[PDB]
Design a protein around this ligand. Structure first.
Ligand SMILES: CC1(C)N=C(N)N=C(N)N1c1ccc(Cl)cc1
Length: 161
């Protein structure tokens, strides 16, 4: 319980956020994001918060920030532990981004939800490295590009050994 999970969209190990046009260009990824975070508390960094400016609905929105909070619809915190504790007694906590945020929660995470997008992005942010020998891949699902998804993509779920 209180299990920590990371959910990210990757183009060749580089982290994709709402700041880029591609998230919106892959509705299927968004549906996968909504499906796996519904009614779960989400933790995001300040920059991820700033790229949406409205809470994700039907979820406790926790913002890990090094600066004082600026929006009273979301819970602002200063540390990883403060973030974990703000989620309460729930089965699964979803860390949704910030490459730096991913890096800080990775050691506490037991589950990863990854979308591998067959696209190239020039962004300098990289998903943190995980030790293949400590992680097991338990689910993967390939999809071609189609009318609404401009790139092919493969969902993957890993769990810590
Ligand atoms: C939509 C997107 C890119 N898709 C996946 N699979 N992982 C995330 N963490 N995402 C995400 C969702 C919300 C926000 Cl605010 C940032 C990223």
């Amino acid at each position: 319980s209180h299990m920590i999970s990371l959910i990210a969209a990757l183009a060749v190990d580089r982290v994709i956020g709402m700041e880029n046009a591609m998230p919106w260009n892959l509705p299927a990824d968004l549906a996968w994001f909504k499906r796996n975070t519904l009614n779960k508390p989400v933790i995001m960094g300040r920059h991820t918060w700033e790229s949406i400016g409205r809470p994700l609905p039907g979820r406790k929105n926790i913002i890990l920030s090094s600066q004082p909070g600026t929006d009273d619809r979301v819970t602002w915190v200063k540390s990883v532990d403060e973030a974990i504790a703000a989620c309460g007694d729930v089965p699964e906590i979803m860390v949704i981004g910030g490459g730096r945020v991913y890096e800080q929660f990775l050691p506490k995470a037991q589950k990863l939800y990854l979308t591998h997008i067959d696209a190239e992005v020039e962004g300098d942010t990289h998903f943190p490295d995980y030790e293949p020998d400590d992680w097991e891949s338990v689910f993967s699902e390939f999809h071609d590009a189609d009318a609404q998804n401009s790139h092919s993509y493969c969902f993957e779920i890993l769990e810590r050994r």
